[PDB]
């Protein structure tokens, strides 16, 4: 109840305007600030207690950001477009030692989005579902977070079927990229923790903070 897809699309339109690994880390930090504003624009999000708001963002920021730049990379050839306006080509990522994860992103996310022509309203809802992760540990009221997630995909399914009547399986197809996003999200994090350990590759304050405990 009260989870209009129009508001979700607005949040998206509101935020969306040499070592390839270093450029990626900088883009991630830059986007972390934009992620918070985006979240505040998501219905009922800011109404949750500040603490659960922190738990939800710290728990999904990576999947949220990955989903965003991936959808933003549909038109791109073999690579991704960073929020900084930089392009990371598949070969460049390979020459940096992160080719494997980069390929999964292009194969399981970017390409799949481009193939089904996932629109911005759909991207938004998926990110909204990720944001509202009822499994996030520490939640003062997981049941409430769960209720919000259900209102989101309920509206998403409504959006679909209505805009894509000829594709009765589109709703499930969108939801079925989450397992891949979750898997790719976990691998990118492992790499990040390694980059921090090694000391090389600059990491800004906000990104660094996300690597803090828990």
């Amino acid at each position: 109840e009260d989870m209009p897809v129009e508001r979700i699309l607005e949040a998206e339109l509101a935020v969306e305007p040499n070592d390839p690994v270093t450029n990626i880390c900088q883009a991630a930090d830059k986007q972390l600030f934009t992620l918070v504003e985006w979240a505040k624009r998501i219905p009922h999000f800011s109404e949750l207690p500040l603490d659960d708001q922190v738990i939800l963002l710290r728990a999904g920021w990576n999947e949220l950001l990955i989903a965003s730049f991936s959808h933003r990379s549909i038109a791109v050839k073999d690579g991704i477009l960073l929020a900084t306006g930089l392009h990371v080509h598949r070969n460049s990522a390979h020459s940096a030692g992160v080719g494997a994860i980069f390929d999964r992103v292009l194969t399981e996310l970017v390409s799949k989005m481009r193939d089904m022509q996932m629109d911005k309203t759909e991207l938004g809802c998926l990110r909204a579902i990720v944001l509202f992760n009822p499994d996030s540990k520490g939640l003062s009221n997981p049941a409430e977070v769960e209720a919000l997630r259900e209102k989101v995909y309920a509206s998403l399914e409504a959006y679909c079927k209505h805009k894509y009547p000829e594709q009765p399986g589109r709703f499930a197809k969108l939801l079925l990229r989450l397992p891949a996003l979750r898997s790719i999200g976990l691998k990118c994090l492992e790499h990040l923790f390694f980059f921090k350990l090694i000391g090389d590759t600059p990491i800004d304050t906000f990104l660094m903070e996300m690597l803090e405990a828990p």
Binding site: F33, V36, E37, K40, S46, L50, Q53, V54, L57, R58, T205, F206, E209, E212, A213
Partner: peptide, 11 residues
């Protein structure tokens, strides 16, 4: 903890 995050969420 999470200095930056809290400050941004609160504003």
């Amino acid at each position: 903890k999470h200095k930056i995050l809290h400050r941004l969420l609160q504003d």
